[PDB]
Write a protein that binds this ligand. Structure first.
Ligand SMILES: *[C@@H]1O[C@H](CO)[C@@H](O)[C@H](O)[C@H]1NC(C)=O
Lengths: 49, 56
């Protein structure tokens, strides 16, 4: 069933017991923290065997 | 506890796992802040079930 990705992430926030307005009010920060955390994994897997 | 949906012209709340549309009210929704922050918010009326009793 399709759903917009920020609305899926808002359901994940309800699932951990965080009220979903906390996602929509911080969405730009949450996306930047996710994108940066995937970047650190490229660096770890590039640098270290 | 739900999701907002539209049939194309009108807006409803519904439960997430089974389509059952309901009028959007102060009781099936909660407020947080103003409309300037949320990416993709839509203008619609939210009904207040006390107001008909004050109109009486
Ligand atoms: C979806 O993307 C369009 C541009 O393609 C934008 O105008 C709109 O505000 C976005 N809506 C949501 C719910 O993110």
């Amino acid at each position: 069933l399709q759903i917009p990705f920020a609305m899926q992430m808002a359901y994940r926030f309800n699932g951990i017991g965080v009220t979903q307005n906390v996602l929509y009010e911080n969405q730009k920060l949450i996306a930047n923290q996710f994108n940066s955390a995937i970047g650190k994994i490229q660096d770890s897997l590039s640098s270290t065997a | 506890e739900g999701v907002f949906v539209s049939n194309g012209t009108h807006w409803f709340v519904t439960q997430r796992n089974f389509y059952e549309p309901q009028i959007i009210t102060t009781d099936n929704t909660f407020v947080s802040g103003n409309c300037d922050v949320v990416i993709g918010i839509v203008n619609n009326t939210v009904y207040d079930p006390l107001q008909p009793e004050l109109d009486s």
